Amino acid sequence: AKIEDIVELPIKGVRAVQSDGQIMFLSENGRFVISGQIYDLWSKKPLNTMSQMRDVAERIHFKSMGMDVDTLNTVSMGRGDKEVVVFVDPRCAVCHQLMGDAKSLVDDYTFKFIVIPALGAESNRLAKNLYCAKDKTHALDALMNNTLGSLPSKETCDPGQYDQTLLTAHFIGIEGVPFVVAPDGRVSKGRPKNLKSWLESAE
Amino acid sequence: AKIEDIVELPIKGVRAVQSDGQIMFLSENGRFVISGQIYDLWSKKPLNTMSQMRDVAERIHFKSMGMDVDTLNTVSMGRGDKEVVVFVDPRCAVCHQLMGDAKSLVDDYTFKFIVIPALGAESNRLAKNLYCAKDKTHALDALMNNTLGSLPSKETCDPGQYDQTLLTAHFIGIEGVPFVVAPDGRVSKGRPKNLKSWLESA
CA distance A78 to A104: 9
Q: B164 and B142 in contact (C-beta within 8 Å)?
A: no
Q: Are residues B199 and B101 in the same domain?
A: yes
- Residue B86 shares a structural domain with residue B144: yes
Please indicate, yes or no, whether residues B195 and B106 belong to a single structural domain of this protein: yes
Whether A43 is covered by a domain: the verdict is yes
A81 and A178 fall within a common domain: yes
Q: Which of A81, A101, A120, A122 is nearest to A198 (CA)?
A: A101
Nearest chain B Cα distance for residue A165, angstroms: 18
One-character DSSP codes across B4-55: EEEEEES-S-EEEEEETTEEEEEETTS-EEEEEEEEETTTTEEE-SHHHHHH
Amino acid present at A165: T
Peptide bond into A203 cis (omega under 30): yes
Q: Is A64 contained in some domain?
A: no
What is the count of residue pairs from A and B with beta carbons less than 8 Å apart? Answer: 130
Could you tell me if A167 lies within 8 Å of chain B, comparing CB atoms? no
Tell me the one-letter amino acid at B120.
G
Q: Which domain holds residue A127?
A: 73-203
Name the resolution in angstroms.
2.3
Does any domain span residue B131? Answer: yes
User: Within this chain, do residues A151 and A198 fall inside the same structural domain, yes or no?
Assistant: yes
Residue A86 sits in the same domain as residue A150? yes
Q: Are A203 and A76 in contact (CB under 8 A)?
A: no
DSSP state of B158: -
User: How many Å apart are CA A120 and CA A56, to the nearest integer?
Assistant: 29
Q: How many domains does chain B have?
A: 2
Q: Smallest CA–CA separation between B160 and chain A, in Å? A: 23
Around Cβ A202, how many Cβ atoms within 10 Å?
Answer: 9
3-state SS, residue B165: helix
Q: What is the C-alpha separation between B166 and A117, in angstroms, rounded?
A: 39
Is A186 found in the same domain as A87? yes
Hey, which residues 68-127 in chain A have their CB within 8 Å of chain B? none
CA-based nearest residue in chain A for residue B170: A29
B30 and B79: one domain?
A: no
Q: CA dihedral in degrees (B38, B43, B48, B53; nearest 10)? A: -90
Interface test with B, best of A2, A6, A11 (most B CBs within 10 A): A11
Cα-trace Rg, chain A: 20
Distance of CA A138 to the CA centre of its chain: 24
CB nearest A36 (choices: B18, B35, B54): B35
Cβ pair B17, B50 in contact under 8 A: no
Q: Which helix (H) or strand (E) holds B24?
A: strand B22-27
Same domain for A177 and A79:
yes
Separation in Å, CA B69 to CA A7, A103, B85, B87: 27, 61, 8, 10
Residue B66 lies in a domain: no
What are the phi and psi torsion angles at B24 (to 5°)? -110, 170
The arrangement of strands across the sheet holding B109-115 comes to: B74-78, B109-115, B82-88, B179-181, B187-189
Q: Does residue A92 fall inside a structural domain?
A: yes
Nearest chain B residue (CA) to A8? B15
Point out the residue among A4, A6, A56 whose CB comes nearest to the CB of B10.
Answer: A56
Angle of the A160-172 helix axis to the A121-131 helix axis, nearest 10: 130
As a whole number of angstroms, the distance between CA A23 and CA A48 comes to 8
Which residues have CB under 8 Å from B55's CB, separation 6+?
A: B185
> Nearest to residue A139, comparing CAs of A71, A77, A70, A68?
A77
Q: What is the CATH number of the domain that holds A166?
A: 3.40.30.10
B83 and B41 inside one domain: no
* Residue A186, C-beta contacts closer than 8 angstroms, at least 6 positions apart: A58, A59, A201, A203
B51 in A contact zone (CB under 8 Å): no
Residues 6+ apart with CB under 8 A from A187: A58, A59, A60, A179, A180, A181
Asked if A35 lies within 8 A of B39 by C-beta distance, the reply is yes
Same-domain check for residues A42 and A112: no
Contact (Cβ atoms closer than 8 angstroms) between residue B72 and residue B174: no
The partner residues of A46 in beta bridges, in order of sequence, read A39
- The reply to whether B100 falls in a domain is yes
Q: Is residue B19, in this structure, part of any structural domain at all?
A: yes
Q: Same domain, yes or no, for A36 and A79?
A: no
Pick from A77, A72, A54, A76: nearest CA to A62: A72
Find, in chain B, the residue whose alpha carbon is nearest to that of A38. Answer: B34
Answer whether B33 sits within 8 Å of A39, measured CB to CB.
Answer: yes
**Is the residue at A67 inside a domain?**
no
